[PDB]
Scaffold this active site. Structure first.
Site, PDB file in Angstrom:
ATOM      1  N   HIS A  74      -4.271  -1.365  -0.847  1.00 36.24           N
ATOM      2  CA  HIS A  74      -5.360  -0.734  -0.103  1.00 36.24           C
ATOM      3  C   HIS A  74      -6.719  -1.162  -0.667  1.00 36.24           C
ATOM      4  CE1 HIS A  74      -3.179   2.534   2.377  1.00 36.24           C
ATOM      5  NE2 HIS A  74      -2.274   1.679   1.934  1.00 36.24           N
ATOM      6  N   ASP A  75      -6.829  -1.422  -1.969  1.00 37.59           N
ATOM      7  CA  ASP A  75      -8.122  -1.899  -2.497  1.00 37.59           C
ATOM      8  C   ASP A  75      -8.398  -3.301  -1.959  1.00 37.59           C
ATOM      9  OD1 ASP A  75      -9.596  -2.472  -5.814  1.00 37.59           O
ATOM     10  OD2 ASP A  75     -10.495  -1.981  -3.873  1.00 37.59           O
ATOM     11  N   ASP A 106       4.839  10.174   1.540  1.00 38.19           N
ATOM     12  CA  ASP A 106       4.510  11.581   1.342  1.00 38.19           C
ATOM     13  C   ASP A 106       3.697  12.158   2.497  1.00 38.19           C
ATOM     14  OD1 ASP A 106       5.605  11.312  -1.293  1.00 38.19           O
ATOM     15  OD2 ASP A 106       3.638  10.866  -2.124  1.00 38.19           O
ATOM     16  N   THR A 165      14.106   0.255  -7.723  1.00 37.65           N
ATOM     17  CA  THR A 165      14.595  -1.091  -7.964  1.00 37.65           C
ATOM     18  C   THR A 165      13.986  -2.104  -6.991  1.00 37.65           C
ATOM     19  OG1 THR A 165      16.751  -0.068  -8.479  1.00 37.65           O
ATOM     20  CG2 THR A 165      16.676  -2.451  -8.331  1.00 37.65           C
TER      21      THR A 165
HETATM   22  C1  HEM Z   1       1.909  -3.636   7.728  1.00 40.04           C
HETATM   23  C2  HEM Z   1       1.732  -3.311   6.323  1.00 40.04           C
HETATM   24  C3  HEM Z   1       1.997  -2.086   5.723  1.00 40.04           C
HETATM   25  C4  HEM Z   1       1.969  -0.836   6.248  1.00 40.04           C
HETATM   26  C5  HEM Z   1       1.527  -0.358   7.625  1.00 40.04           C
HETATM   27  C6  HEM Z   1       2.343   0.068   5.180  1.00 40.04           C
HETATM   28  C7  HEM Z   1       2.421   1.453   5.338  1.00 40.04           C
HETATM   29  C8  HEM Z   1       2.803   2.352   4.347  1.00 40.04           C
HETATM   30  C9  HEM Z   1       3.060   3.757   4.561  1.00 40.04           C
HETATM   31  C10 HEM Z   1       2.811   4.516   5.861  1.00 40.04           C
HETATM   32  C11 HEM Z   1       3.359   4.280   3.351  1.00 40.04           C
HETATM   33  C12 HEM Z   1       3.616   5.750   3.052  1.00 40.04           C
HETATM   34  C13 HEM Z   1       2.443   6.484   2.424  1.00 40.04           C
HETATM   35  C14 HEM Z   1       2.629   7.989   2.364  1.00 40.04           C
HETATM   36  O1  HEM Z   1       2.693   8.662   3.416  1.00 40.04           O
HETATM   37  O2  HEM Z   1       2.683   8.525   1.232  1.00 40.04           O
HETATM   38  C15 HEM Z   1       3.428   3.189   2.412  1.00 40.04           C
HETATM   39  C16 HEM Z   1       3.801   3.295   1.073  1.00 40.04           C
HETATM   40  C17 HEM Z   1       3.865   2.232   0.181  1.00 40.04           C
HETATM   41  N1  HEM Z   1       3.311   0.985   0.397  1.00 40.04           N
HETATM   42 FE1  HEM Z   1       2.981   0.166   2.207  1.00 40.04          FE
HETATM   43  N2  HEM Z   1       2.376  -0.608   3.979  1.00 40.04           N
HETATM   44  C18 HEM Z   1       2.078  -1.921   4.279  1.00 40.04           C
HETATM   45  C19 HEM Z   1       1.903  -2.918   3.324  1.00 40.04           C
HETATM   46  C20 HEM Z   1       2.026  -2.726   1.949  1.00 40.04           C
HETATM   47  C21 HEM Z   1       1.857  -3.771   0.968  1.00 40.04           C
HETATM   48  C22 HEM Z   1       1.380  -5.182   1.305  1.00 40.04           C
HETATM   49  C23 HEM Z   1       2.105  -3.232  -0.245  1.00 40.04           C
HETATM   50  C24 HEM Z   1       1.829  -3.725  -1.517  1.00 40.04           C
HETATM   51  C25 HEM Z   1       1.959  -5.069  -2.029  1.00 40.04           C
HETATM   52  C26 HEM Z   1       2.433  -1.840  -0.020  1.00 40.04           C
HETATM   53  C27 HEM Z   1       3.014  -1.018  -0.993  1.00 40.04           C
HETATM   54  C28 HEM Z   1       3.463   0.288  -0.787  1.00 40.04           C
HETATM   55  C29 HEM Z   1       4.000   1.165  -1.802  1.00 40.04           C
HETATM   56  C30 HEM Z   1       4.382   0.753  -3.217  1.00 40.04           C
HETATM   57  C31 HEM Z   1       4.254   2.350  -1.204  1.00 40.04           C
HETATM   58  C32 HEM Z   1       4.848   3.578  -1.869  1.00 40.04           C
HETATM   59  C33 HEM Z   1       3.862   4.535  -2.511  1.00 40.04           C
HETATM   60  C34 HEM Z   1       4.579   5.726  -3.125  1.00 40.04           C
HETATM   61  O3  HEM Z   1       5.827   5.761  -3.035  1.00 40.04           O
HETATM   62  O4  HEM Z   1       3.874   6.573  -3.703  1.00 40.04           O
HETATM   63  N3  HEM Z   1       2.540  -1.606   1.337  1.00 40.04           N
HETATM   64  N4  HEM Z   1       3.109   2.008   3.053  1.00 40.04           N
HETATM   65 CA    CA Z   2      14.709  -1.061  -3.520  1.00 39.85          CA
HETATM   66 CA    CA Z   3     -11.637  -2.712  -2.024  1.00 40.42          CA
HETATM   67 CA    CA Z   4       3.912   8.738  -3.170  1.00 46.22          CA
END
Ligand code: HEM
Ligand code: CA
Ligand code: CA
Ligand code: CA
Ligand SMILES: *[C@@H]1O[C@H](CO)[C@@H](O[C@@H]2O[C@H](CO)[C@@H](O)[C@H](O)[C@H]2NC(C)=O)[C@H](O)[C@H]1NC(C)=O
Ligand code: MAN
Ligand code: NA
EC number: 1.11.1.13
Length: 357
Positions: free
Chosen positions: A46-47, A179, A196
């Site tokens: 996001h940053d 969340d 993992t």
């Molecule tokens: C089309 C692209 C993507 C979409 C729309 C997407 C969307 C989301 C959504 C909706 C969540 C859940 C957040 C919540 O409700 O707590 C999430 C979590 C996550 N996203 Fe993505 N994401 C995208 C790309 C990325 C990328 C490129 C990375 C990082 C390299 C990233 C890493 C993560 C991580 C690690 C979580 C888990 C956070 C947690 O478990 O606390 N995502 N993402």
């Molecule tokens: Ca996994």
């Molecule tokens: Ca930024």
């Molecule tokens: Ca979380």
């Protein structure tokens, strides 16, 4: 150079990152690929992605620490819902480790966090991003309800990413939970192994959905193949965007290509992260501090497997030109709960600091 602790490194400028890694590990990650690690990895994305070639610099400076330096702006955009916890957790490090820029802190913390996830690559880490920027504008963060055309467009506009690079970056959803998508449940994992860094997310998104871990009506969510939950062990959630990417002709073969291909996935993720981490900067102007990124936990080397209650008959395949691999299935008639905690339990509250975001 030789750092105060006696560590020999590439450049003296990298020394300060050593105690920063140590502090991050001791204070918020505890060497786990857990909740706090997951939230920081999300923050790195996001940053960095809040930048736009077409809109110009005034729209956002990319991997610039803007989320930390302007904690009341971007974290309150609806597409950034939930990012505040990670921002509030890193601000105290910014104040303490005050020779390191907010931007550098964010990217390095993400590399540290990922190193705790078995199978993750050791990210490249370049340093020297300035400590001054602007707040980004809204609309630059991809959202789970977005179409594939919109998502690919956003990534191309942000930094020239190809669809291959885009899907590569979504290997982070192998260690990711939701969340905010559902208001009733928390920490709904995107694959059955959210601690993992394996290829399960690629396989599991291709199974037929059979229910929802929470409500059936959340924006950006679609049916899950493993919706069973109990206590704090929330069922698997499936994002519309992940599902869409897995089936769109532009990305279906790349998606499938990571199934059961751990080293390919990890190497591709590292390459894409190399590009993401320096958005808003010329990489030739940043010093190489990769040697102070912690060595990641290795994978066990096991092939991907269908979770119990699923099998090959459940696949929804979309790649005509590549054979879906032969995988075993974990024994059992019904779905296994996906553990809320890295050590298998359901009780493991992460450290969380209060803050301005
Ligand atoms: C089309 C692209 C993507 C979409 C729309 C997407 C969307 C989301 C959504 C909706 C969540 C859940 C957040 C919540 O409700 O707590 C999430 C979590 C996550 N996203 Fe993505 N994401 C995208 C790309 C990325 C990328 C490129 C990375 C990082 C390299 C990233 C890493 C993560 C991580 C690690 C979580 C888990 C956070 C947690 O478990 O606390 N995502 N993402
Ligand atoms: Ca996994
Ligand atoms: Ca930024
Ligand atoms: Ca979380
Ligand atoms: C980057 O900018 C931040 C924000 O201005 C700086 O954070 C301040 O750091 C000092 C200690 O150096 C603290 O006393 C302040 O409370 C912090 N301000 C805020 C708003 O949190 C940080 O020092 C700068 N880092 C570098 C490398 O220059
Ligand atoms: C996980 O748990 C399920 C039951 O919920 C089993 O079917 C499976 O074999 C594994 O033990
Ligand atoms: Na907030």
């Amino acid at each position: 150079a030789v750092c105060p602790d006696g560590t020999r490194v590439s450049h003296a400028a990298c020394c300060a990152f050593i105690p920063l890694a140590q502090d991050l590990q001791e204070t918020i990650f505890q060497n786990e690929c857990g909740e706090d690690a997951h939230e920081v990895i999300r923050l790195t994305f996001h940053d960095a992605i809040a930048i736009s070639r077409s809109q110009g610099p005034k729209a956002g400076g990319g991997a610039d620490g803007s989320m930390l330096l302007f904690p009341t702006v971007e974290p309150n955009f609806s597409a950034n819902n939930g990012i505040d916890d990670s921002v509030n957790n890193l601000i105290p490090f910014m104040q303490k480790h005050n020779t390191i820029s907010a931007a550098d802190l964010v990217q390095f913390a993400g590399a540290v966090a990922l190193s705790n996830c078995p199978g993750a690559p050791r990210l490249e880490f370049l340093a020297g991003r300035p400590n001054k920027t602007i707040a980004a504008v809204d609309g630059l963060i991809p959202e789970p309800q977005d179409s594939v055309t919109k998502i690919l467009q956003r990534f191309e506009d942000a930094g020239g990413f190809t669809p291959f690079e885009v899907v590569s970056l979504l290997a982070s959803h192998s260690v990711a939970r939701a969340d905010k998508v559902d208001q009733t449940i928390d920490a709904a994992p995107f694959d059955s192994t959210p601690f993992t860094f394996d290829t399960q997310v690629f396989l599991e998104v291709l199974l037929k959905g059979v229910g929802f871990p929470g409500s059936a009506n959340n924006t950006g969510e679609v049916a899950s193949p493993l919706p069973l939950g109990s206590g704090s062990d929330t069922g698997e959630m499936r994002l519309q965007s992940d599902f869409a990417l897995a089936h769109d002709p532009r990305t279906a073969c790349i998606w499938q290509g990571f199934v059961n291909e751990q080293a390919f996935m990890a190497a591709s993720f590292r390459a894409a992260m190399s590009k993401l981490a320096v958005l808003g900067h010329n990489r030739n102007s940043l010093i190489d501090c990769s040697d102070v990124v912690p060595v990641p936990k290795p994978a066990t080397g096991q092939p991907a497997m269908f979770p119990a209650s699923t099998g090959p008959q459940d696949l929804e395949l979309s790649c005509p030109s590549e054979r879906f691999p032969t995988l075993t299935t974990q024994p059992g008639a019904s779905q296994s709960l996906i553990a809320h905690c890295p050590d298998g339990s359901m009780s493991c509250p992460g450290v969380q600091f209060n803050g301005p975001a």
